[PDB]
Amino acid sequence: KVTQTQTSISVMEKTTVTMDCVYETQDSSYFLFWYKQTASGEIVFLIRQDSYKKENATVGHYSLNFQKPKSSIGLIITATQIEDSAVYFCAMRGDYGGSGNKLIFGTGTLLSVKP
Amino acid sequence: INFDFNTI
Amino acid sequence: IQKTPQIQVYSRHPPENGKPNILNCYVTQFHPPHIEIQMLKNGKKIPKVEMSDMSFSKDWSFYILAHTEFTPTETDTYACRVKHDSMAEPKTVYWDRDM
Amino acid sequence: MGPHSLRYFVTAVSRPGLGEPRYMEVGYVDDTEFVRFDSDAENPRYEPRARWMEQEGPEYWERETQKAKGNEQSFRVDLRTLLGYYNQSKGGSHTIQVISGCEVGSDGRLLRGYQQYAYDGCDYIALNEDLKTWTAADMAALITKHKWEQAGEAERLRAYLEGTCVEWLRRYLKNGNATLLRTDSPKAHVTHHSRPEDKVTLRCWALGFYPADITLTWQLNGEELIQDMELVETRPAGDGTFQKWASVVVPLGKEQYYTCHVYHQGLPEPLTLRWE
Amino acid sequence: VTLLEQNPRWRLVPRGQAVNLRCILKNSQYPWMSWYQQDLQKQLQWLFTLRSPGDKEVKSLPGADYLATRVTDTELRLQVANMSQGRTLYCTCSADRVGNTLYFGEGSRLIV
């Protein structure tokens, strides 16, 4: 249902990074999200995409590349700061059995920024 | 098929 | 609101004495949905009365179809008594062969 | 050839004291019930109400039951949330009803999308024709509208209206076709009633027709006597067909000057009858 | 700092000892509250979603027994027992049941 193949990424500040995310759903309407976890354990909401929103979501230096046909929802961080070093998580809602607010999470991809 | 109703 | 029920009592097919038919009690325009409906034969409750599942229409009022097998006889009388919160007393409606 | 619709009528009625609220979902294809869900049951399940629905496999029934199960939780919360908005107590019984769905034209393009809520039998909120804005009926509904506007619910909803609804409608139409689109012409006749006066009663009967929509008129050589005519609401015969009657009070002896007109979609040409 | 208040922040859980976590909603706009766990390998897994006070559920996973309860409109509790491995418990909040963003609390780090 949600897969993020890369384990980790290392770049130098100012660079552009792309975190990959592939998903599997049979729902006609669906919701995709990217979160970030700092060293501290804080899990922060970054950006999302509605399957029915025709455009690629954009928020600050975070951009999504939603490829409906390929079931891909990559997270593009344009021109990186040291502040962006963290574990990046991709998630999709996938409720059943009365779950209510179940998100399915990929395993996360670690990102590094050298000064 | 019906819709997935949120709440008010 | 407290909408007042409308009852119609009639049979499935044109009535013919001694010929087995189905007698219907059609109640509409009520709200709340909770309601007590009973079919009578010569003033005595009719034991087995099948009720339809409830429904409501665009004006938000509910409706229900109550029915029971019957054999029309020249003197037998049949009725439908309905108990609902919008009415002070139970409304009774009598089966009339020409309606 | 025209327009069709797929609509779900939803209801939640609380019953404090006794257990949980009673929840129901009923789907209609062109005004004909075809699916039904009722929580006041054994092991509540989405259930087919038309034989042609049986072609839908187990997947469909599981997915639609799971869906109704979650809708049921939304409605339980709606019920408790409203009590607080209107400051009512927890002992009373209250209802919430919804009508959701769409109307589609001959080309298969969406015509109209419905989403209207009623609390205790009175309008509460409804999506507008633009499919983007809502109209609140009281102060309580502005809270809801505000919340929905913030979360982009109309957009979620519009996506279902124009996609899932339309597509499913087409499919439902393809598989129930014969029964859905069947037509049973009404059988008409006129009866005579008097009650020993100088007046008689002419009653026009329309029986065993489908669909329900019909028109009966009494004429006095060209005149549609709508003011002097008595008639009953169309009623279910209990076997899939419908019945209706229209009566007029006519001067004894002047029977043969009055004509009843039966307009139904199964009739090749409107019917015209007189006492016989 | 979030819309949630989770305590304890961390906790040493002895062998046959049950432990309790508490989560307090600070923003009432988000009444859908859930419990998620994150393992040492760092995989998040949904555990429970309990919207209404009175809601209580028990779930046993490999590595932990759980009992969750929505106590009040702003209070979600969790009892974790029989946990053979460390893991952190997060509280999430959402504004509605379907399609609304979930926001994470700071979590309770259960250490072994």
Coordinates of C-alpha atoms in Angstrom, one line a residue:
Chain A
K1 CA 0.0 0.0 0.0
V2 CA 2.8 2.6 0.7
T3 CA 6.4 2.0 -0.3
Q4 CA 9.5 4.3 -0.1
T5 CA 12.4 2.5 -1.6
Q6 CA 15.3 4.7 -0.6
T7 CA 16.8 4.3 2.8
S8 CA 18.7 7.5 3.0
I9 CA 20.0 10.5 1.1
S10 CA 22.9 12.9 1.7
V11 CA 23.4 16.2 0.0
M12 CA 24.9 19.6 0.6
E13 CA 22.8 22.7 1.5
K14 CA 21.2 24.5 -1.4
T15 CA 20.6 21.3 -3.4
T16 CA 17.2 20.0 -4.5
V17 CA 16.2 16.6 -3.3
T18 CA 13.4 14.2 -4.3
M19 CA 12.0 11.6 -2.0
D20 CA 10.2 8.8 -3.8
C21 CA 6.9 7.3 -2.8
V22 CA 4.9 4.6 -4.5
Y23 CA 1.5 3.5 -3.4
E24 CA -1.2 0.8 -3.9
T25 CA -4.9 1.5 -3.4
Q26 CA -8.1 0.4 -5.0
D27 CA -10.1 3.4 -3.6
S28 CA -11.4 6.0 -6.2
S29 CA -10.8 8.9 -3.8
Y30 CA -7.6 8.8 -1.7
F31 CA -5.3 11.0 0.4
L32 CA -1.5 11.1 0.4
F33 CA 0.7 12.8 3.0
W34 CA 4.3 13.6 3.8
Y35 CA 5.6 14.0 7.3
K36 CA 9.0 14.7 8.8
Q37 CA 10.6 13.5 12.0
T38 CA 13.4 15.4 13.6
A39 CA 16.1 14.0 15.8
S40 CA 13.9 14.9 18.7
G41 CA 11.0 12.6 17.7
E42 CA 8.8 15.4 16.6
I43 CA 6.6 14.2 13.7
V44 CA 5.7 17.2 11.6
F45 CA 3.1 17.5 8.9
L46 CA 4.5 18.8 5.6
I47 CA 2.2 18.6 2.7
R48 CA -0.5 16.5 1.1
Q49 CA -2.2 15.7 -2.2
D50 CA -5.8 14.8 -2.8
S51 CA -6.2 12.2 -5.5
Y52 CA -8.9 14.3 -7.0
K53 CA -6.8 17.5 -7.0
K54 CA -5.6 17.9 -10.6
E55 CA -2.6 20.0 -9.5
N56 CA 0.7 19.2 -7.8
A57 CA 0.4 20.6 -4.2
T58 CA 2.9 23.3 -3.3
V59 CA 3.8 24.6 0.1
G60 CA 7.0 26.7 0.8
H61 CA 10.0 24.9 -0.5
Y62 CA 8.1 21.6 -0.5
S63 CA 6.6 20.5 -3.8
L64 CA 4.9 17.3 -4.8
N65 CA 5.1 15.4 -8.0
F66 CA 1.9 13.5 -8.2
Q67 CA 1.9 10.9 -11.0
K68 CA -1.5 9.3 -10.7
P69 CA -1.0 6.9 -13.6
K70 CA 2.3 5.7 -12.0
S71 CA 1.0 5.7 -8.5
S72 CA 3.9 7.9 -7.5
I73 CA 3.9 10.8 -5.1
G74 CA 7.4 12.1 -4.7
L75 CA 8.4 14.9 -2.3
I76 CA 10.6 17.5 -3.9
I77 CA 12.5 19.8 -1.5
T78 CA 13.8 22.7 -3.5
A79 CA 17.1 24.3 -2.5
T80 CA 17.8 22.7 0.9
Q81 CA 18.8 24.1 4.3
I82 CA 20.5 22.3 7.2
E83 CA 17.1 22.5 8.9
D84 CA 15.7 19.9 6.4
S85 CA 17.8 17.0 7.8
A86 CA 15.3 14.4 9.1
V87 CA 13.5 11.2 8.4
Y88 CA 10.8 11.8 5.8
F89 CA 7.6 9.8 5.9
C90 CA 5.1 9.1 3.2
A91 CA 1.6 8.1 4.2
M92 CA -1.8 7.2 2.8
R93 CA -5.2 6.8 4.5
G94 CA -6.2 3.1 4.4
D95 CA -9.1 2.5 6.8
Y96 CA -11.1 -0.7 7.2
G97 CA -12.8 -2.6 10.0
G98 CA -14.0 0.6 11.7
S99 CA -10.5 2.1 11.9
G100 CA -11.6 5.7 11.6
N101 CA -8.2 7.5 11.2
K102 CA -5.7 5.0 10.0
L103 CA -2.8 6.2 8.0
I104 CA -0.5 3.6 6.4
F105 CA 3.2 4.7 6.7
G106 CA 6.1 4.0 4.4
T107 CA 9.4 3.0 6.2
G108 CA 10.8 6.5 5.9
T109 CA 13.9 7.9 4.1
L110 CA 16.7 9.6 6.0
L111 CA 17.9 12.9 4.5
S112 CA 21.1 14.7 5.3
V113 CA 22.3 18.2 4.8
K114 CA 26.0 19.1 5.1
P115 CA 26.7 22.8 5.7
Chain B
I1 CA -22.5 3.3 -4.1
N2 CA -23.0 5.8 -1.4
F3 CA -20.6 8.4 -0.1
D4 CA -18.3 8.5 3.0
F5 CA -19.9 11.1 5.2
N6 CA -17.9 13.2 7.5
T7 CA -19.5 14.9 10.5
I8 CA -21.1 18.2 11.1
Chain C
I1 CA -41.7 18.9 13.1
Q2 CA -44.6 16.8 14.4
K3 CA -46.2 16.2 11.0
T4 CA -49.6 14.5 11.0
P5 CA -50.0 11.0 9.5
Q6 CA -52.2 10.4 6.5
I7 CA -53.8 6.9 6.3
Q8 CA -55.2 5.1 3.3
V9 CA -56.8 1.6 3.7
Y10 CA -57.6 -0.4 0.6
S11 CA -57.0 -3.8 -0.9
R12 CA -54.5 -5.0 -3.4
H13 CA -57.1 -6.2 -6.1
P14 CA -60.7 -5.2 -6.7
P15 CA -62.7 -6.8 -3.9
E16 CA -64.9 -9.8 -4.5
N17 CA -66.8 -11.5 -1.6
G18 CA -65.3 -14.8 -0.6
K19 CA -62.2 -14.1 -2.8
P20 CA -58.9 -14.0 -0.9
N21 CA -57.2 -10.6 -1.2
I22 CA -54.6 -8.5 0.5
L23 CA -55.6 -5.5 2.6
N24 CA -53.3 -2.5 2.8
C25 CA -52.8 0.3 5.3
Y26 CA -50.8 3.1 3.8
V27 CA -49.5 5.6 6.2
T28 CA -47.6 8.7 5.1
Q29 CA -46.6 12.2 6.1
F30 CA -45.5 11.5 9.7
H31 CA -42.4 12.6 11.7
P32 CA -41.0 11.5 14.0
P33 CA -40.6 8.1 12.5
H34 CA -41.8 6.2 15.5
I35 CA -45.3 5.0 15.0
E36 CA -47.8 2.3 16.1
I37 CA -50.0 0.9 13.4
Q38 CA -52.6 -1.9 13.8
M39 CA -55.1 -3.5 11.4
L40 CA -58.5 -4.5 12.6
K41 CA -61.2 -6.9 11.5
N42 CA -64.6 -6.2 13.1
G43 CA -62.9 -4.2 15.8
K44 CA -60.5 -7.0 16.9
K45 CA -56.8 -6.7 16.4
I46 CA -55.4 -8.7 13.5
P47 CA -52.6 -10.9 14.7
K48 CA -50.2 -11.2 11.8
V49 CA -49.6 -7.9 10.1
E50 CA -46.6 -7.5 7.8
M51 CA -45.0 -4.1 7.8
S52 CA -42.8 -2.6 5.1
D53 CA -39.4 -1.1 5.9
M54 CA -39.5 2.5 6.7
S55 CA -38.7 5.3 4.2
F56 CA -39.0 9.1 4.1
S57 CA -39.4 11.3 1.1
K58 CA -38.0 14.6 -0.1
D59 CA -40.2 16.6 2.3
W60 CA -38.5 14.6 5.1
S61 CA -41.7 12.8 6.3
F62 CA -41.8 9.1 6.7
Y63 CA -44.0 6.5 5.2
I64 CA -44.9 2.8 5.7
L65 CA -47.0 0.2 4.2
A66 CA -48.8 -2.3 6.4
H67 CA -50.6 -5.3 4.9
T68 CA -52.4 -8.5 5.7
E69 CA -54.1 -11.3 3.8
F70 CA -57.9 -11.1 3.8
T71 CA -61.1 -12.4 2.5
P72 CA -63.8 -9.8 1.8
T73 CA -67.2 -10.8 3.1
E74 CA -70.4 -8.7 2.8
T75 CA -70.5 -7.9 6.5
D76 CA -66.9 -8.1 7.7
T77 CA -65.4 -4.8 8.5
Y78 CA -61.7 -3.9 8.5
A79 CA -59.8 -0.9 9.9
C80 CA -56.4 0.6 10.5
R81 CA -55.7 2.3 13.8
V82 CA -52.6 4.4 14.0
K83 CA -50.8 5.8 17.1
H84 CA -48.5 8.7 16.7
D85 CA -47.2 11.5 18.8
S86 CA -48.6 14.2 16.6
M87 CA -52.2 13.1 17.4
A88 CA -54.0 13.4 20.7
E89 CA -55.9 10.2 20.1
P90 CA -55.4 7.2 17.7
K91 CA -56.6 7.8 14.2
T92 CA -58.7 5.1 12.8
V93 CA -59.5 4.6 9.2
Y94 CA -62.0 2.2 7.8
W95 CA -61.8 0.1 4.8
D96 CA -64.3 1.1 2.2
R97 CA -64.9 -1.2 -0.9
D98 CA -65.4 1.8 -3.3
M99 CA -62.1 3.6 -2.4
Chain D
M1 CA -34.8 8.3 -22.9
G2 CA -33.8 11.0 -20.5
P3 CA -32.4 11.8 -17.1
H4 CA -31.8 9.3 -14.3
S5 CA -30.8 9.5 -10.7
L6 CA -29.0 7.6 -7.9
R7 CA -29.9 8.8 -4.5
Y8 CA -29.2 7.6 -0.9
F9 CA -31.7 8.5 1.8
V10 CA -30.0 8.4 5.2
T11 CA -31.4 8.4 8.7
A12 CA -30.2 8.3 12.3
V13 CA -32.6 8.4 15.1
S14 CA -31.4 8.4 18.7
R15 CA -33.3 6.5 21.4
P16 CA -31.7 7.4 24.7
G17 CA -32.5 4.9 27.4
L18 CA -32.7 2.0 25.0
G19 CA -29.3 1.5 23.3
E20 CA -27.7 3.1 20.3
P21 CA -29.3 5.2 17.6
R22 CA -31.1 3.4 14.8
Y23 CA -29.3 3.9 11.5
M24 CA -30.5 3.3 8.0
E25 CA -29.3 3.8 4.4
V26 CA -31.6 3.3 1.4
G27 CA -30.4 3.7 -2.2
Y28 CA -32.8 4.5 -5.1
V29 CA -32.3 4.2 -8.8
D30 CA -34.8 6.5 -10.5
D31 CA -37.1 6.3 -7.5
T32 CA -36.9 2.5 -7.0
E33 CA -35.3 1.1 -3.9
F34 CA -32.4 -1.3 -4.7
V35 CA -30.1 -1.5 -1.7
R36 CA -30.7 -1.1 1.9
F37 CA -28.8 -1.0 5.2
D38 CA -30.4 -1.1 8.7
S39 CA -28.3 -1.3 11.8
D40 CA -31.3 -2.5 13.9
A41 CA -30.6 -6.0 12.9
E42 CA -28.8 -9.3 13.6
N43 CA -25.5 -8.8 11.8
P44 CA -26.4 -5.6 9.8
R45 CA -25.4 -5.8 6.2
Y46 CA -25.7 -3.8 3.0
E47 CA -28.6 -5.8 1.4
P48 CA -29.9 -6.0 -2.2
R49 CA -33.6 -5.0 -2.6
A50 CA -33.9 -5.7 -6.3
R51 CA -33.1 -9.1 -7.8
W52 CA -30.8 -7.6 -10.4
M53 CA -28.5 -6.4 -7.6
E54 CA -27.5 -10.0 -6.9
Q55 CA -25.0 -9.9 -9.8
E56 CA -22.8 -7.7 -7.5
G57 CA -20.2 -10.0 -5.9
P58 CA -19.2 -10.3 -2.3
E59 CA -16.6 -7.5 -2.7
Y60 CA -19.5 -5.0 -3.3
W61 CA -21.5 -6.2 -0.3
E62 CA -18.4 -6.1 2.0
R63 CA -17.2 -2.7 0.8
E64 CA -20.7 -1.2 1.0
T65 CA -21.4 -2.6 4.5
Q66 CA -18.0 -1.3 5.7
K67 CA -18.9 2.1 4.3
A68 CA -22.3 2.2 6.0
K69 CA -20.6 1.1 9.2
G70 CA -18.4 4.2 9.1
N71 CA -21.2 6.4 8.0
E72 CA -23.1 5.1 11.1
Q73 CA -20.3 6.4 13.3
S74 CA -20.4 9.8 11.7
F75 CA -24.1 10.0 12.3
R76 CA -23.8 9.0 16.0
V77 CA -21.4 11.9 16.4
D78 CA -23.6 14.2 14.5
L79 CA -26.5 13.4 16.8
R80 CA -24.4 14.2 20.0
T81 CA -22.9 17.3 18.4
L82 CA -26.3 18.8 17.5
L83 CA -27.7 18.4 21.0
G84 CA -24.9 20.7 22.2
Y85 CA -25.4 23.2 19.4
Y86 CA -29.1 23.5 20.3
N87 CA -28.5 22.9 24.0
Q88 CA -31.0 20.1 24.2
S89 CA -30.9 17.3 26.8
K90 CA -29.7 13.8 26.4
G91 CA -33.0 12.1 27.3
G92 CA -34.8 13.0 24.1
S93 CA -35.0 11.2 20.7
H94 CA -33.8 13.2 17.7
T95 CA -33.4 12.5 14.1
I96 CA -31.0 13.4 11.3
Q97 CA -31.8 12.7 7.7
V98 CA -29.8 13.1 4.5
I99 CA -30.5 13.0 0.8
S100 CA -27.4 12.6 -1.3
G101 CA -26.9 11.7 -4.9
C102 CA -27.1 12.9 -8.5
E103 CA -29.3 13.5 -11.5
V104 CA -27.8 12.7 -14.9
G105 CA -28.9 13.5 -18.4
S106 CA -29.1 11.4 -21.5
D107 CA -25.5 12.1 -22.5
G108 CA -24.3 10.7 -19.2
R109 CA -23.2 14.1 -18.0
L110 CA -24.0 15.2 -14.4
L111 CA -27.0 17.5 -14.2
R112 CA -27.6 18.0 -10.5
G113 CA -25.9 16.8 -7.3
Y114 CA -27.9 16.7 -4.0
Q115 CA -26.7 16.8 -0.4
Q116 CA -29.3 18.1 2.1
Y117 CA -29.5 17.5 5.8
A118 CA -32.5 17.8 8.0
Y119 CA -32.4 17.7 11.9
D120 CA -35.6 16.7 13.6
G121 CA -37.5 17.1 10.3
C122 CA -36.4 20.6 9.5
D123 CA -33.8 21.7 6.9
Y124 CA -30.3 22.1 8.4
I125 CA -27.8 22.5 5.6
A126 CA -27.6 21.8 1.8
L127 CA -24.9 22.0 -0.9
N128 CA -25.8 24.6 -3.6
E129 CA -26.1 24.0 -7.3
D130 CA -22.6 25.3 -7.8
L131 CA -21.5 22.2 -5.9
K132 CA -19.1 24.4 -4.0
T133 CA -21.0 26.3 -1.4
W134 CA -23.5 25.4 1.3
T135 CA -26.6 27.2 2.5
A136 CA -27.3 27.1 6.3
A137 CA -30.8 27.2 7.7
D138 CA -30.0 28.4 11.2
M139 CA -27.1 29.6 13.3
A140 CA -26.2 26.1 14.2
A141 CA -25.7 25.2 10.6
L142 CA -23.3 28.1 10.1
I143 CA -20.9 26.3 12.5
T144 CA -21.1 23.2 10.2
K145 CA -20.7 25.3 7.1
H146 CA -17.7 27.0 8.5
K147 CA -16.1 23.6 9.4
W148 CA -16.9 22.2 6.0
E149 CA -15.6 25.3 4.2
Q150 CA -12.3 25.0 6.1
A151 CA -11.7 21.3 5.3
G152 CA -12.7 21.4 1.6
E153 CA -15.6 19.0 2.1
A154 CA -17.6 20.3 -0.9
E155 CA -14.6 19.5 -3.0
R156 CA -14.4 15.9 -1.6
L157 CA -18.1 15.7 -2.2
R158 CA -18.1 17.1 -5.7
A159 CA -15.4 14.5 -6.6
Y160 CA -17.8 11.7 -5.6
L161 CA -20.8 13.5 -7.3
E162 CA -19.2 13.8 -10.7
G163 CA -17.2 10.5 -10.6
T164 CA -18.3 7.6 -8.4
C165 CA -22.0 8.6 -8.4
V166 CA -22.3 9.1 -12.2
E167 CA -20.2 5.9 -13.0
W168 CA -22.1 3.8 -10.6
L169 CA -25.5 5.1 -11.8
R170 CA -24.6 4.1 -15.4
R171 CA -23.6 0.6 -14.2
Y172 CA -26.7 0.2 -12.1
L173 CA -28.8 1.3 -15.1
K174 CA -27.0 -1.3 -17.3
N175 CA -27.7 -4.2 -14.9
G176 CA -31.3 -3.5 -13.7
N177 CA -32.4 -2.2 -17.1
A178 CA -35.3 -4.4 -17.8
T179 CA -36.9 -4.1 -14.4
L180 CA -36.0 -0.5 -13.8
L181 CA -37.0 0.6 -17.2
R182 CA -40.1 -1.6 -17.4
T183 CA -43.5 -0.1 -17.8
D184 CA -46.8 -1.6 -16.8
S185 CA -49.8 0.2 -18.3
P186 CA -52.6 1.0 -15.8
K187 CA -55.9 -0.9 -16.1
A188 CA -58.7 1.7 -16.0
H189 CA -62.4 1.5 -15.3
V190 CA -65.2 3.7 -14.0
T191 CA -67.6 2.8 -11.2
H192 CA -71.0 4.3 -10.3
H193 CA -72.0 5.4 -6.7
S194 CA -75.2 7.2 -5.7
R195 CA -76.7 7.3 -2.2
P196 CA -80.3 7.9 -3.1
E197 CA -80.1 11.5 -4.2
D198 CA -80.3 13.4 -7.6
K199 CA -76.5 13.0 -7.8
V200 CA -74.1 10.2 -8.7
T201 CA -70.5 9.6 -8.2
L202 CA -68.2 8.8 -11.1
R203 CA -64.9 7.2 -9.9
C204 CA -62.1 6.6 -12.3
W205 CA -59.8 3.8 -11.3
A206 CA -56.2 3.3 -12.5
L207 CA -54.7 0.1 -11.3
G208 CA -51.6 -2.0 -11.6
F209 CA -49.3 0.5 -13.2
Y210 CA -45.6 1.1 -13.1
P211 CA -44.0 3.4 -12.6
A212 CA -46.0 5.4 -10.1
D213 CA -46.2 8.7 -12.0
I214 CA -49.7 9.0 -13.6
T215 CA -52.3 11.7 -14.3
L216 CA -56.1 11.2 -14.3
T217 CA -58.5 14.0 -15.3
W218 CA -62.3 14.2 -15.5
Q219 CA -63.7 16.2 -18.5
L220 CA -67.0 17.7 -19.2
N221 CA -66.7 17.8 -23.0
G222 CA -63.3 19.5 -23.1
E223 CA -63.2 20.8 -19.5
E224 CA -60.6 19.4 -17.0
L225 CA -62.7 19.5 -13.8
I226 CA -59.8 20.0 -11.4
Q227 CA -61.8 22.1 -8.9
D228 CA -64.8 19.7 -8.7
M229 CA -62.7 16.6 -8.8
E230 CA -61.9 14.4 -5.8
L231 CA -58.8 12.0 -6.1
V232 CA -56.4 10.0 -3.9
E233 CA -52.7 10.0 -3.7
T234 CA -51.0 7.3 -5.7
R235 CA -50.6 4.3 -3.5
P236 CA -48.5 1.1 -3.6
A237 CA -50.6 -2.0 -4.3
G238 CA -47.9 -3.9 -2.5
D239 CA -46.7 -6.0 -5.5
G240 CA -44.6 -3.4 -7.3
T241 CA -47.5 -1.8 -9.1
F242 CA -49.5 1.3 -8.1
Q243 CA -53.0 2.5 -7.8
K244 CA -55.0 5.8 -8.0
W245 CA -58.5 7.0 -8.4
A246 CA -60.3 10.2 -9.4
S247 CA -63.9 11.0 -8.8
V248 CA -66.4 13.6 -9.8
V249 CA -69.9 14.4 -8.7
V250 CA -72.3 14.3 -11.7
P251 CA -76.0 15.0 -12.2
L252 CA -77.9 11.8 -12.3
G253 CA -78.6 11.0 -16.0
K254 CA -75.8 13.2 -17.2
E255 CA -73.2 10.5 -16.8
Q256 CA -72.3 10.1 -20.5
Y257 CA -71.1 13.6 -20.8
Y258 CA -68.1 13.1 -18.5
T259 CA -64.8 11.6 -19.6
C260 CA -61.8 10.3 -17.7
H261 CA -58.3 10.7 -19.1
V262 CA -55.6 8.4 -18.0
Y263 CA -52.0 9.6 -18.7
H264 CA -49.4 7.0 -18.1
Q265 CA -46.0 6.3 -19.7
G266 CA -46.9 2.7 -20.6
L267 CA -49.7 3.9 -22.8
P268 CA -49.2 4.2 -26.5
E269 CA -51.9 6.9 -26.3
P270 CA -53.7 8.5 -23.4
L271 CA -56.8 6.6 -22.2
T272 CA -60.3 8.0 -22.3
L273 CA -63.3 6.4 -20.5
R274 CA -66.8 7.0 -19.5
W275 CA -69.3 5.1 -17.2
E276 CA -70.4 1.8 -19.0
Chain E
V1 CA 3.6 22.9 21.3
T2 CA 1.4 20.9 19.1
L3 CA -2.4 20.7 19.6
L4 CA -1.7 17.8 22.0
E5 CA -0.3 17.3 25.4
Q6 CA 1.2 13.9 26.0
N7 CA 2.6 12.7 29.3
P8 CA 4.8 11.1 30.3
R9 CA 7.4 12.1 27.8
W10 CA 9.3 8.9 28.5
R11 CA 9.1 6.1 30.9
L12 CA 11.1 3.1 32.0
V13 CA 8.8 0.0 31.9
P14 CA 9.9 -2.8 34.2
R15 CA 9.3 -6.4 33.2
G16 CA 5.8 -7.4 34.3
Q17 CA 4.7 -3.8 34.7
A18 CA 1.8 -2.2 33.0
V19 CA 2.2 1.5 32.2
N20 CA -0.2 4.4 31.5
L21 CA 0.0 7.2 29.0
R22 CA -2.3 10.2 28.8
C23 CA -3.1 12.6 26.0
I24 CA -4.9 15.9 26.3
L25 CA -6.4 17.7 23.4
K26 CA -5.6 21.5 23.5
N27 CA -7.5 22.5 20.4
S28 CA -11.1 21.4 20.2
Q29 CA -11.3 21.8 16.5
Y30 CA -9.6 18.4 16.2
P31 CA -11.7 15.9 18.1
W32 CA -10.7 12.7 16.3
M33 CA -7.9 11.3 18.4
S34 CA -5.8 8.2 17.8
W35 CA -2.9 6.3 19.1
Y36 CA 0.0 5.3 16.8
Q37 CA 3.1 3.4 17.8
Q38 CA 6.5 3.7 16.3
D39 CA 8.9 0.8 16.6
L40 CA 12.7 0.9 17.2
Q41 CA 13.1 0.4 13.4
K42 CA 11.0 3.4 13.2
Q43 CA 7.9 2.1 11.5
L44 CA 4.7 3.9 12.4
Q45 CA 1.6 1.7 12.9
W46 CA -1.9 2.9 13.6
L47 CA -3.4 1.4 16.8
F48 CA -6.7 3.1 17.7
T49 CA -9.0 6.0 16.9
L50 CA -11.6 6.8 19.6
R51 CA -13.8 9.9 19.1
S52 CA -16.4 9.6 21.8
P53 CA -16.0 9.8 25.6
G54 CA -16.9 6.3 26.7
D55 CA -15.1 4.7 23.8
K56 CA -12.7 2.0 25.0
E57 CA -10.8 -0.7 23.1
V58 CA -8.3 -3.4 23.7
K59 CA -5.8 -4.5 21.1
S60 CA -2.9 -6.9 21.5
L61 CA 0.0 -6.7 19.0
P62 CA 3.2 -8.8 19.1
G63 CA 5.3 -7.0 21.7
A64 CA 2.5 -5.1 23.6
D65 CA -1.0 -5.4 25.0
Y66 CA -3.1 -2.2 24.7
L67 CA -6.2 -0.8 26.3
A68 CA -7.3 2.6 25.0
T69 CA -10.1 4.8 26.3
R70 CA -11.6 8.1 25.3
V71 CA -12.2 9.5 28.7
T72 CA -13.5 13.0 28.0
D73 CA -13.8 15.2 24.9
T74 CA -10.3 16.3 25.5
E75 CA -8.8 13.2 27.1
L76 CA -7.4 10.1 25.6
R77 CA -5.7 7.4 27.7
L78 CA -3.7 4.3 27.0
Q79 CA -2.5 1.4 29.1
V80 CA 0.4 -0.6 27.7
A81 CA 1.4 -3.9 29.1
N82 CA 3.5 -7.0 28.3
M83 CA 5.9 -5.0 26.1
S84 CA 9.0 -6.9 25.4
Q85 CA 10.6 -4.1 23.4
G86 CA 11.0 -0.3 23.5
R87 CA 8.7 1.8 21.3
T88 CA 7.2 5.3 21.3
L89 CA 3.6 6.1 21.5
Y90 CA 2.1 9.1 19.7
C91 CA -1.2 10.8 19.9
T92 CA -2.7 12.2 16.8
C93 CA -5.7 14.5 16.3
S94 CA -7.8 15.3 13.2
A95 CA -10.8 17.5 12.5
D96 CA -13.1 14.8 11.1
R97 CA -13.4 11.1 10.3
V98 CA -12.5 11.0 6.6
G99 CA -9.8 12.8 4.6
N100 CA -8.5 15.4 7.1
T101 CA -4.9 15.8 8.1
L102 CA -3.6 14.0 11.2
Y103 CA -1.4 16.0 13.5
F104 CA 1.1 14.3 15.9
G105 CA 1.7 14.9 19.6
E106 CA 5.3 14.7 20.9
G107 CA 5.0 11.1 22.0
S108 CA 5.8 9.0 25.0
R109 CA 9.1 7.1 24.8
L110 CA 8.6 3.7 26.5
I111 CA 12.1 2.4 27.3
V112 CA 13.2 -1.1 28.2

